[PDB]
């Protein structure tokens, strides 16, 4: 991954994501989310990421 | 018969009532400082606290 001055931006669209497996992983040092609860992330349907 | 606009009082009363009601019903869509104008999405997107 590049440096902070060269942050890498990527587009995610046209896919069926699954955030449950990502959340249940314990390798994350910190996981805090604003505006959306992590538990309900599997029900909302967005436009792009 | 021929000359209209001779019944101004009743029309004014009806117009005032209808306009007040329309303003009240249109006020329902205001954000009022929150993140959404509908409570259903607030329940379907956030966590109680």
Kindly write down the DSSP assignment for every residue of B2-49, as one continuous string.
Answer: -S----HHHHHHHHHHHHHHHHHHHGGG--TTSS-S-HHHHHHHS---
Q: What does chain A come to in residues? A: 49
E runs forming strands in chain A:
none
Q: Distance between CA B34 and CA B37 in Å, rounded?
A: 7
Size of interface A-B (CB pairs under 8 A): 15
Distance, CA of B4 to CA of B6 (rounded, Å): 5
Give per-residue burial for A19-32: e unless 16+ CB within 10 Å, then b.
eeeeeeeeeeeeee
Instruction: Please count the other Cβ atoms lying within 10 Å of the Cβ belonging to residue B21.
Output: 10
Shortest Cα distance from B47 to chain A (angstroms)? 6
Resolution (A): 3.5
CA distances in angstroms from B1 to A3, B9, B43, listed in the order given: 83, 17, 57
The contacts of residue A31 (CB under 8 Å, 6+ apart) are A23, A38
């Amino acid at each position: 991954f590049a440096s902070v001055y060269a942050w890498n931006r990527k587009r995610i669209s046209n896919c069926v994501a699954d955030y449950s497996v990502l959340y249940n992983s314990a390798s994350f040092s910190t996981f805090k989310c604003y505006g959306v609860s992590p538990t309900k992330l599997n029900d909302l349907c967005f436009t792009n990421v | 018969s021929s000359t209209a606009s001779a019944l101004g009082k009743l029309q004014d009363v009806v117009n005032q009532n209808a306009q007040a009601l329309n303003t009240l019903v249109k006020q329902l869509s205001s954000n009022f400082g929150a993140i959404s104008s509908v409570l259903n999405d607030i329940l379907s997107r956030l966590d109680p606290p």
